[PDB]
C-alpha cells in the first residue's frame, strides 16, 4: 500500500529515459539536464493525502493528492495536466492527461528498491531509486 512508499528515495539508474523524454516532446534544454540529474523523491502522507516532493538541481516540485481524486498538476517539463493517482494492488498508478494526450507512471517496490515505469505509447522508461536516510 501507500506506507510501502513513504520514505526518502534517491535515483540511482535510469533506463530509456532520454527516448521517453523525447517521445513526450520535452524540449532539448530540459532533456539534457534531465539525463544527468539524480533527484531525491520524498513521499509522505499528510492526513489522507499523499505528498510527493522532488528535490533536483533542475527543479524542486511538490504535489499533494488523495488517491483516486483528479487534480491539476504542472509537471517539471511545464505540462499542465489533469492527473490521477490510484492504488493498483501494491503499486501506485499516476496518470497524466494533457493536450489530448496521456502518459502514465507506475511506482512499485521490488527488492527494497522503488521502481517507477513510465509509458507513453510504445515508449517505456524505467527509473530505479534506493531508500536513503530521511
Ligand atoms: C527532474 C527533471 C530534471 C527531469 C526533466 C523533466 C521532464 C523530462 C519530466 C518528464 C517526466 C517527469 C518525471 C516523472 C518521474 C520522475 C521521477 C523523479 O526523479 C521525480 C521527478 C521525475 C523525473 C519527473 C520530473 C519531470 C519529468 C522528468
PDB file of C-alpha atoms and ligand atoms in Angstrom:
ATOM      1  CA  UNK A   1       0.000   0.000   0.000  1.00  0.00           C
ATOM      2  CA  UNK A   2       0.968   3.666   0.367  1.00  0.00           C
ATOM      3  CA  UNK A   3       3.033   3.049   3.531  1.00  0.00           C
ATOM      4  CA  UNK A   4       5.470   0.962   1.482  1.00  0.00           C
ATOM      5  CA  UNK A   5       6.437   4.120  -0.440  1.00  0.00           C
ATOM      6  CA  UNK A   6       6.666   6.570   2.496  1.00  0.00           C
ATOM      7  CA  UNK A   7      10.416   7.197   2.600  1.00  0.00           C
ATOM      8  CA  UNK A   8      13.190   9.266   1.060  1.00  0.00           C
ATOM      9  CA  UNK A   9      14.364   7.831  -2.267  1.00  0.00           C
ATOM     10  CA  UNK A  10      17.453   8.657  -4.317  1.00  0.00           C
ATOM     11  CA  UNK A  11      17.645   7.980  -8.047  1.00  0.00           C
ATOM     12  CA  UNK A  12      20.455   5.600  -8.990  1.00  0.00           C
ATOM     13  CA  UNK A  13      19.749   4.305 -12.505  1.00  0.00           C
ATOM     14  CA  UNK A  14      17.565   5.357 -15.432  1.00  0.00           C
ATOM     15  CA  UNK A  15      16.749   3.174 -18.433  1.00  0.00           C
ATOM     16  CA  UNK A  16      15.423   4.504 -21.754  1.00  0.00           C
ATOM     17  CA  UNK A  17      14.697   7.922 -20.209  1.00  0.00           C
ATOM     18  CA  UNK A  18      16.081  10.146 -22.982  1.00  0.00           C
ATOM     19  CA  UNK A  19      13.964   8.205 -25.500  1.00  0.00           C
ATOM     20  CA  UNK A  20      10.861   8.669 -23.309  1.00  0.00           C
ATOM     21  CA  UNK A  21      11.570  12.356 -22.659  1.00  0.00           C
ATOM     22  CA  UNK A  22      11.757  12.886 -26.395  1.00  0.00           C
ATOM     23  CA  UNK A  23       8.546  10.951 -27.024  1.00  0.00           C
ATOM     24  CA  UNK A  24       6.811  13.395 -24.659  1.00  0.00           C
ATOM     25  CA  UNK A  25       8.041  16.344 -26.716  1.00  0.00           C
ATOM     26  CA  UNK A  26      10.257  17.532 -23.869  1.00  0.00           C
ATOM     27  CA  UNK A  27      12.396  20.372 -25.156  1.00  0.00           C
ATOM     28  CA  UNK A  28      16.129  19.847 -25.536  1.00  0.00           C
ATOM     29  CA  UNK A  29      17.036  22.265 -22.735  1.00  0.00           C
ATOM     30  CA  UNK A  30      15.019  20.319 -20.185  1.00  0.00           C
ATOM     31  CA  UNK A  31      16.104  16.998 -21.707  1.00  0.00           C
ATOM     32  CA  UNK A  32      19.896  17.145 -21.439  1.00  0.00           C
ATOM     33  CA  UNK A  33      19.683  18.199 -17.783  1.00  0.00           C
ATOM     34  CA  UNK A  34      17.010  15.579 -17.139  1.00  0.00           C
ATOM     35  CA  UNK A  35      19.534  12.927 -18.184  1.00  0.00           C
ATOM     36  CA  UNK A  36      22.212  13.842 -15.618  1.00  0.00           C
ATOM     37  CA  UNK A  37      20.344  14.971 -12.509  1.00  0.00           C
ATOM     38  CA  UNK A  38      19.547  12.307  -9.905  1.00  0.00           C
ATOM     39  CA  UNK A  39      16.557  13.665  -7.971  1.00  0.00           C
ATOM     40  CA  UNK A  40      15.629  12.966  -4.364  1.00  0.00           C
ATOM     41  CA  UNK A  41      11.961  11.949  -4.095  1.00  0.00           C
ATOM     42  CA  UNK A  42      10.366  12.256  -0.653  1.00  0.00           C
ATOM     43  CA  UNK A  43       6.967  10.561  -0.273  1.00  0.00           C
ATOM     44  CA  UNK A  44       4.814  11.044   2.825  1.00  0.00           C
ATOM     45  CA  UNK A  45       1.176  11.192   3.920  1.00  0.00           C
ATOM     46  CA  UNK A  46      -0.412  14.350   5.305  1.00  0.00           C
ATOM     47  CA  UNK A  47      -3.760  13.238   6.690  1.00  0.00           C
ATOM     48  CA  UNK A  48      -5.490  11.289   3.929  1.00  0.00           C
ATOM     49  CA  UNK A  49      -3.360  12.877   1.182  1.00  0.00           C
ATOM     50  CA  UNK A  50      -0.158  11.557  -0.359  1.00  0.00           C
ATOM     51  CA  UNK A  51       2.577  14.195  -0.693  1.00  0.00           C
ATOM     52  CA  UNK A  52       5.378  13.748  -3.231  1.00  0.00           C
ATOM     53  CA  UNK A  53       8.310  16.172  -3.057  1.00  0.00           C
ATOM     54  CA  UNK A  54      11.158  16.155  -5.584  1.00  0.00           C
ATOM     55  CA  UNK A  55      14.480  17.887  -4.932  1.00  0.00           C
ATOM     56  CA  UNK A  56      16.652  18.377  -8.006  1.00  0.00           C
ATOM     57  CA  UNK A  57      19.264  20.752  -9.385  1.00  0.00           C
ATOM     58  CA  UNK A  58      16.875  21.455 -12.283  1.00  0.00           C
ATOM     59  CA  UNK A  59      13.611  21.960 -10.372  1.00  0.00           C
ATOM     60  CA  UNK A  60      12.026  21.328  -6.990  1.00  0.00           C
ATOM     61  CA  UNK A  61       8.462  20.080  -7.409  1.00  0.00           C
ATOM     62  CA  UNK A  62       5.785  19.123  -4.906  1.00  0.00           C
ATOM     63  CA  UNK A  63       2.340  17.593  -5.351  1.00  0.00           C
ATOM     64  CA  UNK A  64      -0.455  16.588  -2.975  1.00  0.00           C
ATOM     65  CA  UNK A  65      -3.409  14.361  -3.790  1.00  0.00           C
ATOM     66  CA  UNK A  66      -5.911  11.883  -2.453  1.00  0.00           C
ATOM     67  CA  UNK A  67      -5.881   8.516  -4.207  1.00  0.00           C
ATOM     68  CA  UNK A  68      -8.460   8.389  -6.985  1.00  0.00           C
ATOM     69  CA  UNK A  69      -9.241  12.132  -6.916  1.00  0.00           C
ATOM     70  CA  UNK A  70      -8.245  14.038 -10.053  1.00  0.00           C
ATOM     71  CA  UNK A  71      -6.163  17.182  -9.598  1.00  0.00           C
ATOM     72  CA  UNK A  72      -4.324  19.789 -11.643  1.00  0.00           C
ATOM     73  CA  UNK A  73      -0.580  19.154 -11.968  1.00  0.00           C
ATOM     74  CA  UNK A  74       2.091  21.358 -13.535  1.00  0.00           C
ATOM     75  CA  UNK A  75       4.866  18.903 -14.348  1.00  0.00           C
ATOM     76  CA  UNK A  76       8.585  19.642 -14.200  1.00  0.00           C
ATOM     77  CA  UNK A  77       8.623  19.855 -18.014  1.00  0.00           C
ATOM     78  CA  UNK A  78       5.872  22.513 -17.825  1.00  0.00           C
ATOM     79  CA  UNK A  79       2.915  20.349 -18.888  1.00  0.00           C
ATOM     80  CA  UNK A  80      -0.446  21.419 -17.459  1.00  0.00           C
ATOM     81  CA  UNK A  81      -2.100  18.054 -16.819  1.00  0.00           C
ATOM     82  CA  UNK A  82      -5.190  16.550 -15.273  1.00  0.00           C
ATOM     83  CA  UNK A  83      -3.688  13.823 -13.096  1.00  0.00           C
ATOM     84  CA  UNK A  84      -4.980  10.918 -11.011  1.00  0.00           C
ATOM     85  CA  UNK A  85      -3.006   8.632  -8.694  1.00  0.00           C
ATOM     86  CA  UNK A  86      -4.552   5.362  -7.528  1.00  0.00           C
ATOM     87  CA  UNK A  87      -3.665   2.082  -5.860  1.00  0.00           C
ATOM     88  CA  UNK A  88      -3.306  -0.902  -8.214  1.00  0.00           C
ATOM     89  CA  UNK A  89      -2.570  -3.857  -5.980  1.00  0.00           C
ATOM     90  CA  UNK A  90       0.696  -2.916  -4.278  1.00  0.00           C
ATOM     91  CA  UNK A  91       1.608  -0.317  -6.925  1.00  0.00           C
ATOM     92  CA  UNK A  92       0.780   3.360  -7.412  1.00  0.00           C
ATOM     93  CA  UNK A  93      -0.511   4.378 -10.847  1.00  0.00           C
ATOM     94  CA  UNK A  94      -0.072   8.063 -11.744  1.00  0.00           C
ATOM     95  CA  UNK A  95      -1.972   9.110 -14.882  1.00  0.00           C
ATOM     96  CA  UNK A  96      -1.389  12.461 -16.597  1.00  0.00           C
ATOM     97  CA  UNK A  97      -3.652  13.819 -19.356  1.00  0.00           C
ATOM     98  CA  UNK A  98      -2.838  16.955 -21.348  1.00  0.00           C
ATOM     99  CA  UNK A  99      -3.474  18.371 -24.833  1.00  0.00           C
ATOM    100  CA  UNK A 100      -5.460  15.275 -25.796  1.00  0.00           C
ATOM    101  CA  UNK A 101      -2.522  13.003 -24.871  1.00  0.00           C
ATOM    102  CA  UNK A 102      -1.789  10.796 -21.862  1.00  0.00           C
ATOM    103  CA  UNK A 103       1.191   9.224 -20.103  1.00  0.00           C
ATOM    104  CA  UNK A 104       1.456   7.002 -17.054  1.00  0.00           C
ATOM    105  CA  UNK A 105       3.835   6.230 -14.195  1.00  0.00           C
ATOM    106  CA  UNK A 106       3.813   3.003 -12.157  1.00  0.00           C
ATOM    107  CA  UNK A 107       5.551   3.093  -8.770  1.00  0.00           C
ATOM    108  CA  UNK A 108       6.356  -0.275  -7.205  1.00  0.00           C
ATOM    109  CA  UNK A 109       8.658  -1.704  -4.546  1.00  0.00           C
ATOM    110  CA  UNK A 110      10.828  -4.521  -5.873  1.00  0.00           C
ATOM    111  CA  UNK A 111      13.600  -5.978  -3.704  1.00  0.00           C
ATOM    112  CA  UNK A 112      13.710  -2.964  -1.385  1.00  0.00           C
ATOM    113  CA  UNK A 113      14.118  -0.507  -4.267  1.00  0.00           C
ATOM    114  CA  UNK A 114      11.460   1.779  -5.715  1.00  0.00           C
ATOM    115  CA  UNK A 115      10.996   1.033  -9.418  1.00  0.00           C
ATOM    116  CA  UNK A 116       8.993   3.514 -11.489  1.00  0.00           C
ATOM    117  CA  UNK A 117       7.835   2.641 -15.003  1.00  0.00           C
ATOM    118  CA  UNK A 118       6.983   5.443 -17.431  1.00  0.00           C
ATOM    119  CA  UNK A 119       4.893   4.711 -20.512  1.00  0.00           C
ATOM    120  CA  UNK A 120       3.982   6.913 -23.472  1.00  0.00           C
ATOM    121  CA  UNK A 121       2.536   4.625 -26.135  1.00  0.00           C
ATOM    122  CA  UNK A 122       5.125   2.010 -27.045  1.00  0.00           C
ATOM    123  CA  UNK A 123       7.986   4.005 -25.476  1.00  0.00           C
ATOM    124  CA  UNK A 124       8.820   2.875 -21.937  1.00  0.00           C
ATOM    125  CA  UNK A 125      11.427   4.075 -19.444  1.00  0.00           C
ATOM    126  CA  UNK A 126      12.341   2.597 -16.053  1.00  0.00           C
ATOM    127  CA  UNK A 127      13.784   4.584 -13.138  1.00  0.00           C
ATOM    128  CA  UNK A 128      15.345   2.976 -10.066  1.00  0.00           C
ATOM    129  CA  UNK A 129      15.547   4.522  -6.590  1.00  0.00           C
ATOM    130  CA  UNK A 130      17.307   3.401  -3.422  1.00  0.00           C
ATOM    131  CA  UNK A 131      15.982   4.139   0.051  1.00  0.00           C
ATOM    132  CA  UNK A 132      18.110   6.819   1.727  1.00  0.00           C
ATOM    133  CA  UNK A 133      18.200   8.455   5.140  1.00  0.00           C
ATOM    134  CA  UNK A 134      15.378  10.862   5.957  1.00  0.00           C
TER     135      UNK A 134
HETATM  136  C1  LIG B   1      13.519  16.248 -12.908  1.00  0.00           C
HETATM  137  C2  LIG B   1      13.943  16.820 -14.216  1.00  0.00           C
HETATM  138  C3  LIG B   1      15.446  17.067 -14.194  1.00  0.00           C
HETATM  139  C4  LIG B   1      13.571  15.936 -15.392  1.00  0.00           C
HETATM  140  C5  LIG B   1      13.078  16.651 -16.576  1.00  0.00           C
HETATM  141  C6  LIG B   1      11.563  16.873 -16.566  1.00  0.00           C
HETATM  142  C7  LIG B   1      10.751  16.121 -17.620  1.00  0.00           C
HETATM  143  C8  LIG B   1      11.595  15.192 -18.500  1.00  0.00           C
HETATM  144  C9  LIG B   1       9.578  15.384 -16.991  1.00  0.00           C
HETATM  145  C10 LIG B   1       9.028  14.198 -17.791  1.00  0.00           C
HETATM  146  C11 LIG B   1       8.684  13.110 -16.842  1.00  0.00           C
HETATM  147  C12 LIG B   1       8.840  13.749 -15.485  1.00  0.00           C
HETATM  148  C13 LIG B   1       9.270  12.882 -14.366  1.00  0.00           C
HETATM  149  C14 LIG B   1       8.449  11.657 -13.946  1.00  0.00           C
HETATM  150  C15 LIG B   1       9.244  10.873 -12.939  1.00  0.00           C
HETATM  151  C16 LIG B   1      10.147  11.457 -12.123  1.00  0.00           C
HETATM  152  C17 LIG B   1      10.793  10.637 -11.019  1.00  0.00           C
HETATM  153  C18 LIG B   1      11.588  11.500 -10.049  1.00  0.00           C
HETATM  154  O1  LIG B   1      13.002  11.553 -10.123  1.00  0.00           O
HETATM  155  C19 LIG B   1      10.823  12.763  -9.708  1.00  0.00           C
HETATM  156  C20 LIG B   1      10.724  13.640 -10.959  1.00  0.00           C
HETATM  157  C21 LIG B   1      10.554  12.922 -12.297  1.00  0.00           C
HETATM  158  C22 LIG B   1      11.881  12.925 -13.038  1.00  0.00           C
HETATM  159  C23 LIG B   1       9.566  13.703 -13.110  1.00  0.00           C
HETATM  160  C24 LIG B   1      10.110  15.105 -13.282  1.00  0.00           C
HETATM  161  C25 LIG B   1       9.716  15.778 -14.536  1.00  0.00           C
HETATM  162  C26 LIG B   1       9.885  14.822 -15.686  1.00  0.00           C
HETATM  163  C27 LIG B   1      11.317  14.269 -15.728  1.00  0.00           C
END
